[PDB]
Amino acid sequence: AEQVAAERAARKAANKEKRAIILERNAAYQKEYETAERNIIQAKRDAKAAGSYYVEAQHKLVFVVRIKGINKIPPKPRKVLQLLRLTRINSGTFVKVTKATLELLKLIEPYVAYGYPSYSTIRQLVYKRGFGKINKQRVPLSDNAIIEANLGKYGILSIDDLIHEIITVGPHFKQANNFLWPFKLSNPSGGWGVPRKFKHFIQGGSFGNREEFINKLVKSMN
């Protein structure tokens, strides 16, 4: 009476319940993303028609990549790179924008490329290079149940729940972002552009704020 035929079926029914919830969550998130972006486009249009200027809300998320190697770093940038968990070259981390962290990003400015990531790059980063931290031990995601086993207390059920909590900086961004292992990115597949990396992007190099060109960069590195 080991009840394999009914234990497997009850577990399958629970699996289908969870998948129904995940499906309706993702449909709600897709409608939310679409109405947010169309409302920003229409707000720009309506301000131009009124003669106003629509100023966008300032960006709340940057994606930081350490672009300089390990040797010859001064101790205060070295400490801040460890604190942002950028401990090797082409490491990446999502960063919530506050004053308390925009002054970290000014200290580590010659050693990192950052900017504002789009939904396409967050989606591709988390599907391809997304790893959790589970007793710590760097576990690949590849399953919604293992995401739910550590982030279900925060109401994060699936990988797209994780992506949504990253991109809309929710109340559990800190937990969802510290659960992700720092992204281990390759070199950019086309190159950096820029014959010399270690200038500012404004000055024709790589480091600093490259506000929305970080999407092109990280898609080449991913």
Partner: protein
């Protein structure tokens, strides 16, 4: 390369096995390794770690210390568990009814415990009659009462017992130890 924050390949700094080649203590470690893994009682993990410890990390527990622990409120019928030697004590004249599970008993300690109507138990019989450490009281002997710890941290204004072979007048009671000869300490 990686900017390592922690030291790499760092061992825990904890015994994960006894350093002794005692076959019976290895059997006790095998039993309590099994219990600490399959029971999820915290007692079994604590007893396994205490089974790993060295000789100065397992001081003897006196029977007077056992009796004083049994004079706690609600702890009269508890099984006293000493992971180590139980020694006798002639300074106590009343000994209560007790079950004491220990690695070793001295002859006087075994005689006193079973003369008071009690029972002396090994750790495997403790595991059989209490697999989860139910109704137990773990007792540890005084670690820093050792003679070596007197000399630990010797320095100025410490009051921490110089390492000295012969003791008396003419042995380090002069310049550096009183105001009259030079300075005090």
């Amino acid at each position: 390369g990686i900017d390592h924050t922690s030291k790499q390949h760092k061992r825990s700094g904890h015994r994960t096995a006894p350093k002794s080649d005692n076959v019976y203590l290895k059997l006790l470690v095998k039993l309590y390794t099994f219990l600490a893994r399959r029971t999820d009682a915290p007692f079994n993990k604590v007893v396994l770690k205490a089974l790993f410890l060295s000789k100065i990390n397992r001081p003897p527990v006196s029977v007077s210390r056992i009796a004083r622990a049994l004079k706690q409120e609600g702890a009269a019928n508890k099984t006293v568990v000493v992971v180590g030697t139980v020694t006798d004590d002639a300074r106590i004249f009343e000994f209560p009814k007790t079950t004491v599970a220990a690695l070793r008993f001295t002859a006087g300690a075994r005689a006193k415990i079973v003369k008071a109507g009690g029972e002396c138990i090994t750790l495997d019989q403790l595991a059989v009659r209490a697999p989860k450490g139910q109704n137990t009281l773990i007792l540890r002997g005084p670690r820093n009462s050792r003679e070596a710890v007197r000399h630990f941290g010797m320095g100025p204004h410490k009051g921490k017992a110089p390492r000295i072979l012969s003791t008396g007048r003419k042995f380090e009671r002069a310049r550096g130890r009183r105001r009259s000869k030079g300075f005090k300490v």
